[PDB]
Scaffold this active site. Structure first.
Site, short mmCIF file in Angstrom:
data_model
loop_
_atom_site.label_atom_id
_atom_site.label_comp_id
_atom_site.label_asym_id
_atom_site.label_seq_id
_atom_site.Cartn_x
_atom_site.Cartn_y
_atom_site.Cartn_z
N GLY A 1 -12.14 4.38 -1.11
CA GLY A 1 -13.17 5.17 -0.45
C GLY A 1 -14.36 4.41 0.10
N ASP B 1 0.84 -1.18 0.00
CA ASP B 1 0.00 0.00 0.00
C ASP B 1 0.89 1.25 0.00
OD1 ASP B 1 0.85 0.30 2.68
OD2 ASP B 1 -0.98 -0.55 3.51
N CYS C 1 -13.48 -27.91 6.59
CA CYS C 1 -12.22 -27.24 6.33
C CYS C 1 -11.05 -28.20 6.17
CB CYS C 1 -11.92 -26.25 7.47
SG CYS C 1 -10.38 -25.34 7.26
N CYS D 1 -7.61 -27.96 11.37
CA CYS D 1 -8.82 -28.78 11.48
C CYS D 1 -8.54 -30.27 11.28
CB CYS D 1 -9.87 -28.28 10.50
SG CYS D 1 -10.45 -26.61 10.91
N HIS E 1 -6.11 -21.27 10.59
CA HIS E 1 -7.42 -21.70 10.15
C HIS E 1 -8.18 -20.59 9.43
CE1 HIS E 1 -11.49 -23.12 9.90
NE2 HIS E 1 -11.83 -21.97 10.44
N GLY F 1 1.10 3.81 2.07
CA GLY F 1 1.48 4.39 3.34
C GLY F 1 0.55 5.48 3.83
N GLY F 2 -0.20 6.09 2.92
CA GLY F 2 -0.99 7.25 3.27
C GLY F 2 -2.24 6.98 4.07
N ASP G 1 -8.13 -7.42 0.22
CA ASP G 1 -7.26 -7.56 1.38
C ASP G 1 -8.06 -7.21 2.62
OD1 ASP G 1 -6.92 -4.52 0.67
OD2 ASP G 1 -6.23 -4.76 2.73
N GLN H 1 -11.74 7.22 -6.61
CA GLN H 1 -12.42 7.85 -5.48
C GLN H 1 -13.74 8.45 -5.96
OE1 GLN H 1 -11.51 7.64 -2.32
NE2 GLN H 1 -9.54 6.61 -2.65
N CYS I 1 -7.87 -27.40 6.30
CA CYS I 1 -6.61 -26.84 6.81
C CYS I 1 -5.96 -27.75 7.85
CB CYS I 1 -6.84 -25.44 7.39
SG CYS I 1 -7.20 -25.34 9.16
O1 LIG Z 1 -9.50 4.63 -0.53
C1 LIG Z 1 -8.54 4.01 -0.08
N1 LIG Z 1 -7.23 4.30 -0.45
C2 LIG Z 1 -6.14 3.69 0.02
N2 LIG Z 1 -6.26 2.72 0.95
C3 LIG Z 1 -7.51 2.33 1.43
C4 LIG Z 1 -7.61 1.40 2.46
C5 LIG Z 1 -8.87 1.07 2.98
N3 LIG Z 1 -9.22 0.23 4.04
C6 LIG Z 1 -10.53 0.33 4.11
N4 LIG Z 1 -11.32 -0.30 4.98
C7 LIG Z 1 -10.79 -1.15 6.03
C8 LIG Z 1 -11.87 -1.95 6.73
N5 LIG Z 1 -11.33 -2.84 7.81
C9 LIG Z 1 -12.31 -3.92 8.15
C10 LIG Z 1 -11.73 -4.85 9.18
C11 LIG Z 1 -11.32 -4.11 10.43
C12 LIG Z 1 -10.39 -2.96 10.09
C13 LIG Z 1 -10.98 -2.06 9.03
N6 LIG Z 1 -11.07 1.15 3.18
C14 LIG Z 1 -10.01 1.65 2.44
C15 LIG Z 1 -9.92 2.57 1.42
C16 LIG Z 1 -8.68 2.94 0.91
CL LIG Z 2 -8.76 -4.16 6.69
ZN LIG Z 3 -9.53 -25.18 9.40
#
Ligand SMILES: O=c1nc[nH]c2cc3[nH]c(NCCN4CCCCC4)nc3cc12
Ligand SMILES: [Cl-]
Ligand SMILES: [Zn+2]
Ligand SMILES: O=c1nc[nH]c2cc3[nH]c(NCCN4CCCCC4)nc3cc12
Ligand SMILES: [Cl-]
Ligand SMILES: [Zn+2]
Lengths: 364, 364
Positions: A211, A92, A299, A304, A330, A94-95, A261, A184, A301
């Site tokens: 976004g 990613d 599963c 399991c 798992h 970093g921002g 991800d 975006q 894995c």
């Molecule tokens: O618009 C984005 N640009 C750069 N990186 C991003 C990363 C992002 N991460 C998320 N959401 C993360 C949701 N996550 C769910 C599990 C618990 C922690 C938060 N939206 C994003 C949008 C962006």
């Molecule tokens: Cl996340």
């Molecule tokens: Zn498993």
């Protein structure tokens, strides 16, 4: 091996399945990327990450650029060598975490308690030895006014061009890595269209939908995906950042997403939540104290195959590291098996039925 | 396979090397036993424990008898099945940690905030499915007056007889497991002799030297071992409880000890101390931040084949679980390689030279 070649082998509605060939390996799509925070997928050796079926991992850049630092990691031979993962890594910019974890914004970039710019982000990802480089962007907060969403998206598009130029100026990076742009525009269709147009004009190897997963909820996320993903070039991968729960992933694939991800399988794992085909369970619950069944009945894995719910219950309640290890392996394996079932069902033209069957059982 | 058969293959001075054959496997001696606290060798899968060379592990009983409880573990199929280790397990009596971690003492046993007696200890170890059962004893505090050491040792000998009788009364336990007695007597030669006499009169499969590594220091521990170990039956294994650092182990083998257990390699591992042939190092130290060498230059373990000091330094400073995993696997592997070198050098009649060479380099 090719630098970056995306091939779509099969389609069902908006869903696609295929492969991305890169120099360090093949990525089967739709793909889930385990998250490496500070150069480790938490509680797993890289060989274990691979054993679960992962083709590629996400390397967070934010922590690494602080310690050990990007120059230091490059001196030590790059992120792949450093952490012992020799397959593709998407980094990613970093921002996102700068805004989340540490700030002053300007057209140049973001200052924080260091200045991170599109050019510096690309250089850091180069020093880490990233295979898929993300353009440096701005994740618009939710909710946003149309005017705020517009000015934010426009800055991101200017940063996308600067990311493209910085990447292209580094011969070794341009020869061996790929660059993704990030759409975006918040929840606004016209802004999403303007963003897609700008990114396509610049040209990227893949396109992320940014976004989203920032508090809007699944219904709204799906509504935005409905019109946003078709705006992206059909012939390149579509990456939904930070998503998500298993049902989020299935719905996003139904809407044309190829890559994901999320920290959920790892983070949940450590906190006692295991994913199963009958929905998540909290292994700490007393009902599992004498349960000899595996975490999930189907599963494949290694966890399991060998250990019971009762044992893992005991480990997590005792705060044992092995509990975190087993839950995490798992959960990542479950996510990979979900992706495999998605890939197979699209290939076989029965993904619609799979999605329906999955939901009926997962939410029973 | 035999229940318990000890064979001495070679000797050098007081040092011996050989094998203990048991139903669940062979134990090469001198042996080091990794410690399983609450049914796990911390931060390691059992397959990894075995990969390091371990033939047998020590299962702490104290925590397990509280949660999940001995009856519960038996209902779940026994400790071996529960934790996924199918080789021999030596279980301690539970009493040492009762005195250390939780008390009212009597001739019946120890009450604590539950009553633990020789009979209850043997039954708990039976329910866990222990392969080597320890007699329930009393570890005399150090220092002790001769009179206090005497009364303590005499109670332990009465408890040793009660442990023997309880073990022998349980047909399945007597058929499939072994029982070790524990010598007491503090630092006093006459009491150590009386204790050895009592234990030999009762008869055990092996004999532990108890009451040491409790603050007396290496010089004094070695002095007591000098006269204490020859008092034990030569033809049975000699087990030094809770020892120790690598140099402690070498010196104890020189004095006739065949078996060891210690939390040091695991506990140190998690805390950033790695054992090497050139002595221990603290991997958190800044001097390792760019060190691409493995933890130890000669170590055959999987950690040293794949990761650098610099990476493990980074992990431990970041508080990452993988740091604990890698440090622990290396430290346990180092201990096993130490035991292998001890076994080989005794077999080859060059253990004296090995001990000298080891010390010269380890303490350089
Ligand atoms: O618009 C984005 N640009 C750069 N990186 C991003 C990363 C992002 N991460 C998320 N959401 C993360 C949701 N996550 C769910 C599990 C618990 C922690 C938060 N939206 C994003 C949008 C962006
Ligand atoms: Cl996340
Ligand atoms: Zn498993
Ligand atoms: O006399 C004993 N009887 C039953 N169990 C024992 C356990 C022992 N553990 C120790 N020493 C443990 C030393 N260890 C060193 C590393 C750090 C934690 C403490 N002496 C022991 C004597 C006995
Ligand atoms: Cl110990
Ligand atoms: Zn090693």
């Amino acid at each position: 091996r090719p630098r970056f070649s995306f091939s779509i082998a099969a389609r069902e509605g908006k869903a696609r399945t295929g492969t991305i060939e890169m120099k360090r390996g093949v990525i089967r799509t739709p793909a889930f990327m385990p998250v490496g925070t500070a150069a480790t997928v938490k509680a797993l050796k890289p060989e274990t990450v691979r054993a679960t079926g992962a083709d590629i991992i996400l390397g967070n850049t934010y922590h690494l650029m602080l310690r050990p630092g990007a120059e230091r990691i490059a001196k030590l031979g790059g992120l792949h060598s450093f952490m012992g993962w020799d397959r593709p890594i998407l980094t990613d910019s970093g921002g996102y975490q700068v805004m989340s974890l540490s700030t002053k914004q300007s057209e140049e970039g973001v200052t924080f308690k260091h200045m991170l710019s599109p050019e510096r982000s690309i250089e850091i990802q180069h020093l880490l030895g990233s295979d898929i480089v993300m353009a440096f962007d701005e994740c618009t907060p939710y909710p946003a006014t149309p005017s705020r969403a517009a000015s934010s998206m426009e800055r991101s598009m200017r940063w996308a061009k600067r990311s493209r130029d910085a990447f292209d100026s580094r011969k070794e990076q341009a020869e061996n890595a790929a660059l993704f742009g990030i759409q975006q525009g918040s929840v606004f269709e016209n802004l999403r269209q303007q963003s897609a147009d700008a990114l396509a004009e610049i040209g990227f190897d893949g396109y992320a939908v940014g976004g989203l997963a920032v508090g809007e909820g699944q219904d709204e996320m799906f509504r935005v995906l409905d019109f946003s993903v078709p705006m992206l070039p059909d012939d390149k991968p579509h990456y939904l950042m930070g998503v998500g729960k298993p049902d989020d992933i299935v719905g996003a694939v139904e809407r044309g997403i190829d890559m994901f991800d999320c920290v959920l399988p790892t983070r949940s794992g450590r906190n006692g939540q295991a994913f199963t085909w009958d929905g998540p369970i909290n292994i700490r619950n007393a009902r599992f104290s004498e349960d000899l069944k595996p975490l999930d009945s189907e599963c494949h894995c290694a966890v399991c195959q060998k250990w019971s719910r009762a044992y893992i219950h005991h480990l997590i309640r005792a705060g044992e590291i092995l509990g975190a290890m087993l839950m995490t392996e798992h959960n990542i394996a479950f996510y990979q098996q979900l992706m495999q079932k998605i890939r197979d069902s699209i290939s076989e033209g029965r993904f619609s039925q799979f999605a329906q069957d999955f939901r009926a059982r997962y939410f029973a």
